[PDB]
Amino acid sequence: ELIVNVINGPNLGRLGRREPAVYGGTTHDELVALIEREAAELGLKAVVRQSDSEAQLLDWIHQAADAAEPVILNAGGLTHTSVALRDACAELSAPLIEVHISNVHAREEFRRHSYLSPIATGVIVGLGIQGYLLALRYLAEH
Amino acid sequence: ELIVNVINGPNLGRLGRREPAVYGGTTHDELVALIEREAAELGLKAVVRQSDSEAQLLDWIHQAADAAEPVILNAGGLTHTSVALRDACAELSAPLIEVHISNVHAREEFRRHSYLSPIATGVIVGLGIQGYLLALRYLAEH
Amino acid sequence: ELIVNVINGPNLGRLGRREPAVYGGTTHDELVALIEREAAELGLKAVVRQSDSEAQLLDWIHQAADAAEPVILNAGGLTHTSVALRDACAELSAPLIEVHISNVHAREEFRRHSYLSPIATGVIVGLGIQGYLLALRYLAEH
Amino acid sequence: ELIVNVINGPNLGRLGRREPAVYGGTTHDELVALIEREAAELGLKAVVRQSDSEAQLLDWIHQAADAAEPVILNAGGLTHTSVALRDACAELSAPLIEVHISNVHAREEFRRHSYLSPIATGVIVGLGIQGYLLALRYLAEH
Amino acid sequence: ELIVNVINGPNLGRLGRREPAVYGGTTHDELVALIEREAAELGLKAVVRQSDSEAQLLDWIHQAADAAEPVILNAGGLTHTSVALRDACAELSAPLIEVHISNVHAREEFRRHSYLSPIATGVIVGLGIQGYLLALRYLAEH
Amino acid sequence: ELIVNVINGPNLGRLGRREPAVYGGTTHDELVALIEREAAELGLKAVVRQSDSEAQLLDWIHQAADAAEPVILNAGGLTHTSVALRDACAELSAPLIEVHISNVHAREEFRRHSYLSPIATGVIVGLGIQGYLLALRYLAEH
Amino acid sequence: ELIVNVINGPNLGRLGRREPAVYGGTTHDELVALIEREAAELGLKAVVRQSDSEAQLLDWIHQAADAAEPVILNAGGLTHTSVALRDACAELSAPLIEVHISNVHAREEFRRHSYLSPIATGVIVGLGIQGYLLALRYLAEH
Amino acid sequence: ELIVNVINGPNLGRLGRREPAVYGGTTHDELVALIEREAAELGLKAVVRQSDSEAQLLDWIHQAADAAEPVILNAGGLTHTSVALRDACAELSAPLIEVHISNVHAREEFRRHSYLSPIATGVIVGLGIQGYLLALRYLAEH
Amino acid sequence: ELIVNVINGPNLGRLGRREPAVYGGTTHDELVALIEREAAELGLKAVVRQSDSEAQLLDWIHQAADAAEPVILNAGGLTHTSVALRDACAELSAPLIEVHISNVHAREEFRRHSYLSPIATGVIVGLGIQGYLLALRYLAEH
Amino acid sequence: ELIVNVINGPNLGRLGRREPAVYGGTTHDELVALIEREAAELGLKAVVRQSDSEAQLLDWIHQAADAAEPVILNAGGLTHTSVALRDACAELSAPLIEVHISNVHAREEFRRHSYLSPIATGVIVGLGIQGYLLALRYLAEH
Amino acid sequence: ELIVNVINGPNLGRLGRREPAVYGGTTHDELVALIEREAAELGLKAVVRQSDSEAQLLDWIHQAADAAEPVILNAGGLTHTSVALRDACAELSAPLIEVHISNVHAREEFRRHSYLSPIATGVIVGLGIQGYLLALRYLAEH
Amino acid sequence: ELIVNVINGPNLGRLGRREPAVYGGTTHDELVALIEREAAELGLKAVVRQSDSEAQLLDWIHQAADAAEPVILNAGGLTHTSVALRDACAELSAPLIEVHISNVHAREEFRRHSYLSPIATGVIVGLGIQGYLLALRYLAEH
Ligand SMILES: COc1ccc(C[C@@H]2C(=O)[C@@H](O)[C@H](O)C[C@]2(O)C(=O)O)cc1
Ligand SMILES: COc1ccc(C[C@@H]2C(=O)[C@@H](O)[C@H](O)C[C@]2(O)C(=O)O)cc1
Ligand SMILES: COc1ccc(C[C@@H]2C(=O)[C@@H](O)[C@H](O)C[C@]2(O)C(=O)O)cc1
Ligand SMILES: COc1ccc(C[C@@H]2C(=O)[C@@H](O)[C@H](O)C[C@]2(O)C(=O)O)cc1
Ligand SMILES: COc1ccc(C[C@@H]2C(=O)[C@@H](O)[C@H](O)C[C@]2(O)C(=O)O)cc1
Ligand SMILES: COc1ccc(C[C@@H]2C(=O)[C@@H](O)[C@H](O)C[C@]2(O)C(=O)O)cc1
Ligand SMILES: COc1ccc(C[C@@H]2C(=O)[C@@H](O)[C@H](O)C[C@]2(O)C(=O)O)cc1
Ligand SMILES: COc1ccc(C[C@@H]2C(=O)[C@@H](O)[C@H](O)C[C@]2(O)C(=O)O)cc1
Ligand SMILES: COc1ccc(C[C@@H]2C(=O)[C@@H](O)[C@H](O)C[C@]2(O)C(=O)O)cc1
Ligand SMILES: COc1ccc(C[C@@H]2C(=O)[C@@H](O)[C@H](O)C[C@]2(O)C(=O)O)cc1
Ligand SMILES: COc1ccc(C[C@@H]2C(=O)[C@@H](O)[C@H](O)C[C@]2(O)C(=O)O)cc1
Ligand SMILES: COc1ccc(C[C@@H]2C(=O)[C@@H](O)[C@H](O)C[C@]2(O)C(=O)O)cc1
């Protein structure tokens, strides 16, 4: 199947806005372009969505559940806090790849826990924006 | 630079030996072949080593430290237990990508802790043997 | 008084959609019908609402607070995570019955904690969709 | 099948004896009468027993195991402490409904843990003596 | 009022039997005699009972609740484990003095917790058999 | 600069509605008026906003980040639960003053933890609605 | 000395009654016969007793203390909960061998703690009913 | 009433002495002057005292208890360690405002606990020396 | 020997000063008189001292160590916090009886821990000022 | 099948060398002789190996996995620390009996945890060198 | 620079007074003499002070801060309890060597924590009074 | 006796190799020379060994046990992880001095725990390479 859903959670629309010492440079719009391009090279179609609203994220997850489509999810802070997002993700029959740009293990202790990792197929963290592209390649070869 | 070190720790020589319901099929020799091939496609040279001996792993890490070469490390059970391996890895100036074949977050609680993740560049788990190939691609694009 | 509010939180609109091995069969629309029918047999009027949005749930709780109406609440994942929902529920002067379809004590440890149970009148879990009907009957006899 | 066992543990024979500010009013004998009456309205026969002796409770549970009869159990303080009672209850093939009169989540932290909840079909707490009658109705509709 | 109940729990009938290096010398019968004598000097009547059966202890506590009589309780190992005994003791309207012969704080960590201390009037530990006599004197002056 | 953002989170629109024994009397509209008046006396302009929606709060925080404006934040229950709100607040270059009306240390243990306090400039709790006015005065003198 | 006491606690009278997928097949009466036979082959006399009553178990332990006889004890659920049984067992001058049929380390975490193991001579778990026979052989060779 | 007691604990006499990168600049004598001036503008009299001696602090607290005078307390390290200071502060009938210059939540975990916060009226941290002046203003408006 | 040292720690000089709902009525001077009188009836001499200064308490303990005199100690808040006081008390060769007026187990969890209880002969709590007199009687009979 | 592997880990070669108050008397060579003799009486062949090297232990475990041979394992300190040894042992299809000479529950708390017990068939501790012989007898009867 | 401050905390004046089985023999005066002599051999001047008063210790630390002089500190029980002493020690610009006579890791668990170790240059424990002399030698060679 | 064993564990052969900002400058060979020289000045002979292999370290410890020779041990990462090394060290009859170059209390929390400290004579940390020389001097004076 061509279709892969890339879903970004709270604050992910802020990439590139604060000082390019940090998660700066690549904007969310640029990230979408990079993803779409890589997906086309791989023979996939990426549908990339971002929201600061948990309810909106839940709706996108429900739609992927109903369509049996794979999901690459960076849930932002909700990674660490939301059982509701886990409940929705546990419905997915297709692969779920959890992605984080930063190395969530190199910061505060509360970031080393994810409600999603135990139900995800796999997890990529700390490899920057390329982590999304690597997830796409996993899905293309599976 | 061409050279990337792939270092596999205890029990990783056992891939493919127990019932192909599990981490079965791909042998360690096959894994080496897959890695070497992908590395050549990427314009890298992969040097793949496996040992059940922590001391041997430490020596390989020291050599990568001295040569300023990147390391893709799957330390096996020592991931969860060895401060000595962390101490050696903290010396590396080039990237360190932690890889696990299985999703270490979907099993016992003790597997969700890694001495290596806080000092690694990033971490890939649960994406099977392709996780090594994805790490290689990260290193090629950086 | 006739009026009882039944409020369902995130993911509760998904009942009946995934494989009828699981929380499958009864849809949310069917649940509403069952509740309305039981409420009429008991001489009550049930107002049944579901949302994936915490803000919407909070508004429904506020309205029940202002009207001094009882609430039967299945907050879904927010049961385990939301202090805001607890704060809103602590305002209710009429009874609050917490309901869960599944036995929240027979799963992961994080599901055995509820922010709501300490401020609820009582709690029913694991009795399936009938738990809502039993809550209704409690309220009718009180 | 007609037969449902209602089993009450330590101190449950004390209902109604201390000041009717508290769990006062309804005596254990009255509780038995209420249960028997509700059971007959539902087309069941309730066999209601109470003991302060764990060994006696265990024998009643064994008998329900051997007869494949459902059990409504309020184990009193043993809810929070007895692995032996859990071991005996895990043998039951018919439903086990855990009931508590008080809201065990609104008191000391040690009362929020039950050895029985993980192996019970479901749990009703905080709905007073009506919780037993609601358990009976669950069993009648299943 | 004259009457004070002294209630001893499991293993307390073993005083004086194992090597008089330890809680040896004074037998339970001797303890009863010492208590009765001190009580008469104080103008009280002590009713001293011992059982290895929690159910029997519960019955004695119930009787003290119903008679509004003070209780001096050394619950033995049940001090550290029984919520049922606490539930029964919380019914007592007259004073409850918890007594232990040994210093329960000078041994294993699990002995430093008592289900009874938070609901007792007070607690005497480590003063040997005289702790019972001191409890009696407290009750005589109050 | 004149402009200070006062942002109130879930349930803060409920001030003054439940029995004036409690956080009763001052309504949210009154709070806004008090804040605006104090801000004008101090030579500032306060922009006061309240929402029960985390996504809306995040947008207001983003806008303050982009405008480099100070924020006085009472995040309500999200204080204790939301990593996403912390992530957004960590972007602010201007001061962040955390305010709570109640003394969050005098209630349940879960209220003594704040995701925001470690990244805030400072914190005021328990001084009632005047805490907002005191935060304003801090910002005016800095 | 010939005499060894085998003492079985709550629920041990249930062996062989529930579906022979589980601890099924060997009944408690059969277990007694196997033990007696092995004891005679070893030149010992086994006295095998079972009770669901902690008080009865305590009396049997007291008798072994007074007679200076070894004890093979499978305390069932009381293994994990009873300080009183530990107190009684600490009196034994002869060896105490703790036995469990099941591997108590391969189940819930609460089963991995025993009040008895620290005061037992040794412990055998997970070797089925043969664990009793192996304990007997230990005692015969010592 | 005019009189407010400002009490500073151990090390607070060190303000301004170590390198003005840190809590440098304002000396304790300067702090006293700032406080006195602000108090006079508010129509109060501030009595400002500092000691490194817990016993001296206790005496000042006792005097405020006896005089029914409000206290603004920065107990320094004793904030985190002293139950005796809490015991003395619990006697105060007038308001107690806890103040810290630094943000105690932005440092080591042990600094996020205060024995005083649960019994204080409120708490101000991280707003520098102005926190004292803001406490004064709270007391003037109440 | 006649001499017994009664040592009272921080805040104990405050008895009787705050509202006689609480630890009110008996002043410290009255307590001294009661103790002296009881000691004379018992054929002892009580030397009663109180200080809010840990250093002063330590000196009194040292003197009791050097003189091999028994100590009845109510260390106030230092009970829960001071290792130094424990170190000094561990030197005492004569009995050490820990006394608290209030039931330290019926309040906050931090009050249920004492650095002194493990090294004391015994402990009396919750029996009011009579606890001192009962300690005196223990020492007279030993 | 005849063949049983007895594998001893670090420090087990030290038996009998330090003062025969302790694990003294029986040397490792003597242990091997005792095991071989018992195995022959049982109709088995025991292959007994000891190493201080985790890598060597892993190789012996791998060989038992490949040959489908039972293992009696005393991993010494690695019992408490090595996930790698657990990973290797989880491959074994034949029984795994964990043995310890000492009672690991009667010492430091860290010795009461074993990475091996949850995946072993059973566990024998505290029965001295006879524990190996008893394991052999288990395997002979199964 | 010649000058080194040796500061001893509570109870350190008790060295040599209790039975020379223990920290007996060397008195505090002897310790001072040994230190002074070693310091002169090393070309230093040691200023040795001891107090049971935390306030006095704080003053000595302040003076060392102001003079930029090194400190060898054995804070006695305050090692384990005092944040105030840590706050004062964090001001020191010259080296801080923490010394304990006893091995603080070989006793109760609470002694294995030090508020001082994280801010000290280094730590010497368990080497008796020579630990002070070794600290002096460290300072002489640096 | 002349002979002292200095044993260095994993990674200690790396001293001086990574950037002389850090544990840089002194190489392991230089460390050996410094130790040998100091030992000769003290009238001792130091035998200095380093290995990355736990098995090799264990053999060196065994040899020191058999020869009754003192050991100065810096076990590197195994300090924090190895029970096997502790088991071997507990055999030593001569002194064991634990040394670390860095201050293990000033880094991650896992470094503040040592399996060796409770069985060592004493411990020196944070005093750099001179810590070894100071250990040597301790042993020379004892
Ligand atoms: C202020 O905007 C952002 C955007 C992304 C992040 C990182 C992402 C999060 O939202 C974190 O809560 C999470 O721990 C890591 C993260 O998901 C990532 O690295 O992609 C943080 C702040
Ligand atoms: C029996 O051989 C193996 C080989 C690999 C594994 C998985 C790897 C480990 O060694 C585990 O300790 C680790 O938690 C996960 C692992 O590193 C992986 O999934 O690659 C387990 C057993
Ligand atoms: C994917 O849709 C659902 C719907 C309901 C549930 C169960 C409900 C929840 O949302 C859980 O988070 C909660 O622990 C139990 C639950 O509230 C219930 O059993 O009703 C789970 C997933
Ligand atoms: C003194 O008699 C009683 C009777 C019932 C209770 C409540 C029941 C218990 O025995 C408690 O231990 C349990 O936590 C709650 C309880 O099972 C109930 O509410 O039914 C308490 C004391
Ligand atoms: C074997 O007989 C006894 C008798 C009394 C005790 C001490 C009492 C107990 O039953 C302990 O569980 C409890 O911790 C202390 C005790 O209640 C006492 O010291 O009186 C112990 C064993
Ligand atoms: C039902 O409406 C409210 C409004 C405010 C509060 C207090 C605020 C919260 O939302 C709490 O979750 C928080 O712990 C304290 C609070 O932020 C405050 O005191 O301002 C509680 C319930
Ligand atoms: C329902 O009857 C039984 C009988 C034996 C057991 C196992 C035994 C127990 O009573 C458990 O509580 C214990 O953890 C293990 C057990 O003692 C054994 O395996 O022998 C469980 C249920
Ligand atoms: C070395 O002098 C000082 C002075 C003040 C402080 C900060 C204050 C303390 O004493 C800390 O223990 C406390 O955690 C914070 C503090 O009370 C404040 O920020 O006012 C620290 C060191
Ligand atoms: C404000 O004066 C006092 C006096 C005594 C107390 C009780 C005593 C303390 O100092 C407490 O810290 C301790 O927990 C209990 C106490 O030692 C007692 O009840 O005697 C409390 C406050
Ligand atoms: C110094 O040589 C030894 C040999 C055996 C032991 C006991 C074994 C260990 O290696 C311990 O780590 C383990 O906790 C217990 C042990 O496995 C046993 O009792 O057989 C200890 C030290
Ligand atoms: C009764 O006099 C003393 C003197 C020194 C000590 C040891 C020192 C202490 O004060 C302890 O609190 C600390 O844990 C260890 C100690 O600092 C040392 O060994 O020097 C103990 C009791
Ligand atoms: C990369 O080489 C090294 C060498 C020494 C260290 C410090 C030593 C260790 O191996 C640490 O695991 C330990 O916590 C501290 C250490 O033992 C020391 O400071 O000597 C660290 C890395």
Residue of H nearest to F113 (CA): H112
- Alpha carbons L127 and K125: distance in angstroms, whole number: 13
Q: Which residues of E are catalytic?
A: 23, 100
Find out whether G49 and G5 touch, Cβ atoms under 8 Å: yes
Name the token pair of I29. Answer: 């001077």
The string of DSSP codes covering E5-61 is EEEE-TTGGGTTTS-TTSS-S--HHHHHHHHHHHHHHTT-EEEEEE-S-HHHHHHHH
Dihedral sign (CA L99, L101, L103, L104) = negative
Residues 6 or more apart whose CB falls under 8 angstroms from that of B141 comprise: A130
Which residue of J53, J56, J77 is in closest CB contact with L87?
A: J77
Whether the CB-CB separation of A69 and A100 falls below 8 Å is answered with no
DSSP J70: -
In the residue annotation, I138 being an active-site residue is answered as no
Nearest to G137 by CA among G37, G16, G68: G37
- Secondary structure (DSSP) of B88-139: HHTT--S-EEEEESS-TTSS-GGGG--SSTTTSSEEEESSTTHHHHHHHHHH
I80 token code pair: 């829960």
Q: Residue F29 carries which side chain, given as an amino acid letter?
A: D
Token digits of residue H97: 């405002």
Do B10 and J55 form a contact (C-beta atoms < 8 A)? Answer: yes
The H-or-E segment that residue F122 falls in is: strand F122-125
R_g of chain A, CA atoms, integer Å: 14
* ∠ CA L55-L60-L65, rounded to 5°: 120
Residue type at E123? Answer: V
CA-closest candidate to residue E76, choices G124, H51, I122, G54: G54
CA angle D125, E56, I122 (to 5 degrees): 95
| Domains parsed from chain H with CATH numbers | 1-142 (3.40.50.9100)
DSSP string computed for B35-50 = HHHHHHHTT-EEEEEE
D118: its two tokens: 């993980």
Residues of chain F with C-beta less than 8 angstroms from the C-beta of A59:
none
Q: Report the candidate in F58, F89, F70 with the shortest Cα–Cα distance to residue F136.
A: F70
Q: Are G28 and G13 in contact (CB under 8 A)?
A: yes
Please tell me the distance from the alpha carbon of residue E94 to that of residue E106, in angstroms, as a whole number: 30
Tally of CB atoms within 10 A around H25: 12
With beta carbons less than 8 A apart as the criterion, state whether C67 and C1 touch: no
**Residue C111, annotated as binding a ligand:** yes
Resolution of the structure in the document, Å: 2.0
Q: Are strands F122-125 and F71-74 parallel, antiparallel or unpaired?
A: unpaired
Q: Indicate the DSSP class of residue L101.
A: S
Tell me the two tokens of residue D16. Answer: 């109604």
- The minimal CB distance from D138 to the residues C97, C134, C142 is found for C134
Beta strand pairing call for G122-125 and J122-125: antiparallel
Distance E75 CA to ligand 5 centre (A): 8
Closest chain F CA to residue H137: F134
Beta bridge partners of F48: F6
SS3 F96: strand
Contact J77, L87 (CB under 8 A): yes
Of L14, L51, L54, the CB nearest to B62: L14
Tokens standing for G44?
A: 């010992």
Cα dihedral sign, K86-K90-K93-K96: positive
Residue of D101, D3, D93, D99 whose CA lies nearest to D46:
D3
Distance between CA D130 and CA D134 in Å, rounded? 6
**Contact J127/G112, CB-based, under 8 Å?**
no
Token output for L17: 């190799």
Asked if C124 and D119 come within 8 Å (Cβ–Cβ), the reply is no
Residue type, H76: G
Q: Give the position of tokens 């003037």.
A: H140
**Phi, psi angles (nearest 5°) of residue F33:** -60, -45
Q: How far is CA F129 from CA C88, F5, F132, H118, in A?
A: 19, 16, 6, 19
Q: How far apart are CA J6 and CA J97, in angstroms?
A: 9
Please check whether residue I136 is in contact with residue I72, taking contact to mean a CB–CB distance below 8 angstroms: yes
C-alpha span between F59 and F37 (Å, rounded): 25
Give yes or no for residue B78 CB within 6 A of ligand 2.
no
Nearest CA in chain J to G128: J122
Angle E130-141/I130-141 helices, nearest 10 degrees? Answer: 140
D79 and chain G in contact, CB less than 8 A = no
For residues G110 and D114, give the distance between their C-alpha atoms in angstroms, rounded to a whole number: 12
Here the tokens at position I111 are: 């009050």
Residues in contact with I37: Cβ distance below 8 Å, sequence separation at least 6, in sequence order: none
Distance CA F7, CA F72 (A): 6
Q: Which structure tokens are listed for A75?
A: 């849930």
Residue K107 CB contacts under 8 Å (≥ 6 apart), including other chains = none
Q: Distance between alpha carbon C103 and the CA centroid of its chain, in Å?
A: 14
Residue type, A131: G
Beta bridge partners of L124: K124, L99
Distance CA J82, CA J48 (A): 21
Q: How far apart are CA I84 and CA K75, in angstroms?
A: 10
Record the tokens describing residue D38, joined without a space. 């509700």
Chains C and D touch (3+ CB pairs under 8 A): yes
| Nearest chain D Cα distance for residue E108, angstroms | 19
CB contact under 8 A, E80 and G83: yes
User: Alpha helices of chain I — where are they, by DSSP H?
Assistant: 28-41, 54-67, 83-89, 130-141
The alpha carbon of residue A100 and the mean position of all alpha carbons in its chain are separated, in whole angstroms, by 7
> What SS3 class is residue L130?
helix
CA of I113, closest CA in chain E: separation in Å?
9
Judged by DSSP in three states, F18 sits in coil
DSSP code string of chain G = --EEEEEE-TTGGGTTTS-TTSS-S--HHHHHHHHHHHHHHTT-EEEEEE-S-HHHHHHHHHHHHHHT--EEEE-GGGGGT-HHHHHHHTT--S-EEEEESS-TTSS-GGGG--SSTTTSSEEEESSTTHHHHHHHHHHHH-
To test ligand 9's pocket by mutation, which of I80, I97, I104 has the most ligand atoms within 8 angstroms of CB? I104
End-to-end Cα, chain F, rounded Å? 10
Q: Which amino acid is at A52?
A: D
Q: Which residues pair with B96 in a beta bridge?
A: B71
In angstroms, the CA H93 to CA H71 distance is 10
- Neighbouring residues of F44: CB distance < 8 A, sequence distance ≥ 6: F2, F3, F4, F136, F139, F140
Return the SS3 of A124. strand
State in Å: Cα E112 to ligand 11 middle.
Answer: 25
- Atom nearest to K9 CA in ligand 11: 10
The answer to whether the beta carbons of residues B18 and J91 sit under 8 Å apart is yes
Neighbours of chain C (3+ CB pairs under 8 A): A, D, F
| 8 Å CB contact between F18 and C61 | no
* Interchain contact E/D (3 or more Cβ pairs less than 8 Å): yes
Partner residue facing H118 (CB), from F106, F117, F124: F106
- CB within 8 Å of chain D, chain E residues 99-118: none
Chain B residue with the nearest C-alpha to that of L52: B55
**Tokens representing residue G17 in the block:** 């009654």
Strand order in the sheet with I71-74: E45-50, E3-8, E71-74, E96-100, E122-125, I122-125, I96-100, I71-74, I3-8, I45-50
Calculate the CA dihedral of residues I100, I106, I109, I114 and round it to 10 degrees.
Answer: 20
**Looking at the DSSP assignment, which residues form a beta bridge with residue A72?**
A6, A97
Q: Which of L12, L14, L54, L85 is most worth mutating to test chain B (most B CB atoms within 10 A of its CB)? A: L14
Whether B51 sits inside 8 A of J54 (CB atoms) is: no
